[PDB]
C-alpha cells in the first residue's frame, strides 16, 4: 500500500543496529573499487569478543582466490591453499571485522549519517518484507566503515529495513558511480558464532 515514512524507520534501525552483537553477512563488490581487491564474502561475525568465520573470493596479483577465513583472538587466518591455514597476523592491520558492528563507526554510524532518506519501494530480502530507502551517506561515515572508498563527498546509498518486527537493517549499498558499488546483506541477528 502506502509506504511508511523513511525517517523513523531509519532511526529505529539505527537503534537496533547499535545493540547488535552478531550477524551473518554477505558482502558483494560490484564493478571495481581501487584498493579493494575483494569480490564476494559470506561469513558470520560476533563481537565482544570479536570472532568471525566464513569464505572470501578475492583477487591476488590478478588471480581470483577462493579462501576460507577465521578471525580469532585478534588474528586473521585463511586457507589460500585448500585445507592449509596460514596466519596473516593481527586482523586489524588489514581490516578488523568488528568495525562493521561498532556502534560509533560501523553500520549504525552509516545509518546515523544517512541524509535525505526517502522510501522508494518494497522488496523481499531473505524471505522478509523490507522497505527500500534512498539517501546519501556522509563521506566521513563511508570512509570509516570502508576506507578504500576515499570519499570526499556524500555517497549515494540504498538501505533496506525490515518493514515490521525489529526493523533491522537487512541490506545496504554504497554507490561509487560508474557501475561500481559495495553491498552488504545482513541476517541471523544474534546468532551464536563458534569459530
Q: From 55, 52, 36, select the one nearest 44 (Cα to Cα).
A: 52
Residues 83-102 that bind ligand Z69 (CB under 6 A): 88, 91, 93-95, 97, 100
Task: Look up cell 588471480; give the residue.
Answer: 63
- Kindly tell me which of 5 and 32 has the beta carbon lying closer to ligand Z69: 32
d(CA 70, CA 68): 7
146 in contact with ligand Z69 (CB under 6 A): yes
State which of residues 171, 174, 176, 181 lies at the interface with ligand Z69 (CB under 6 A): 174
- Kindly tell me which of 128 and 143 has the beta carbon lying closer to ligand Z69: 143
Output the furthest CA–CA distance in the chain (Å, rounded). Answer: 53
Set of cell numbers at residue 94: 588489514
Q: How far is the CB of 1 from ligand Z69 (least distance, A)?
A: 30
Q: How far is the CB of 104 from ligand Z69 (least distance, A)?
A: 15
User: What is the three-class DSSP state of 28?
Assistant: strand
The answer to whether the CB of 85 falls within 8 A of the CB of 76 is: no
Number of residues that bind ligand Z69 (CB under 6 A): 33
User: What is the three-class DSSP state of 59?
Assistant: strand
- Kindly tell me which of 3 and 57 has the beta carbon lying closer to ligand Z69: 57
The answer to whether the CB of 44 falls within 8 A of the CB of 54 is: yes
State which of residues 6, 10, 52, 141 lies at the interface with ligand Z69 (CB under 6 A): 52
Beta bridge partners of 136: 115, 156
Provide the binding-site residues for ligand Z69, judged by CB under 6 A: 25, 27, 35-38, 41, 43, 45, 52, 56, 58, 60, 67, 69, 71, 76, 78, 88, 91, 93-95, 97, 100, 145-148, 172, 174, 182, 184
Amino acid at each position: 500500500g502506502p509506504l511508511p515514512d523513511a525517517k523513523p524507520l531509519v532511526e529505529e534501525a539505527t537503534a537496533q543496529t547499535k545493540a547488535l552483537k552478531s550477524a551473518h553477512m554477505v558482502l558483494t563488490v560490484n564493478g571495481k573499487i581501487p584498493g579493494l581487491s575483494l569480490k564476494t564474502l559470506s561469513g558470520d561475525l560476533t563481537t565482544n569478543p570479536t570472532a568471525a568465520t566464513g569464505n572470501v573470493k578475492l583477487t591476488l596479483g590478478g588471480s581470483d582466490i577462493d579462501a576460507d577465513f577465521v578471525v580469532f583472538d585478534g588474528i586473521l587466518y585463511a586457507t589460500l591453499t585448500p585445507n592449509q591455514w596460514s596466519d596473516f597476523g593481527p586482523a586489524a592491520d588489514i581490516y578488523d571485522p568488528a568495525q562493521v558492528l561498532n556502534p560509533d563507526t560501523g553500520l549504525a554510524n552509516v545509518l546515523a549519517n544517512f541524509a535525505d532518506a526517502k522510501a522508494e519501494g518494497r522488496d523481499t530480502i531473505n524471505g522478509q518484507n523490507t522497505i527500500r530507502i534512498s539517501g546519501k551517506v556522509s563521506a566521513q561515515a563511508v570512509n570509516q566503515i570502508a576506507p578504500p572508498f576515499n570519499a570526499t563527498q556524500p555517497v549515494p546509498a540504498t538501505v533496506w529495513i525490515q518493514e515490521t518486527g525489529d526493523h533491522q537493517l537487512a541490506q545496504a549499498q554504497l554507490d561509487r558511480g560508474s557501475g561500481n558499488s559495495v553491498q552488504m546483506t545482513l541476517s541471523k541477528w544474534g546468532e551464536k558464532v563458534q569459530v
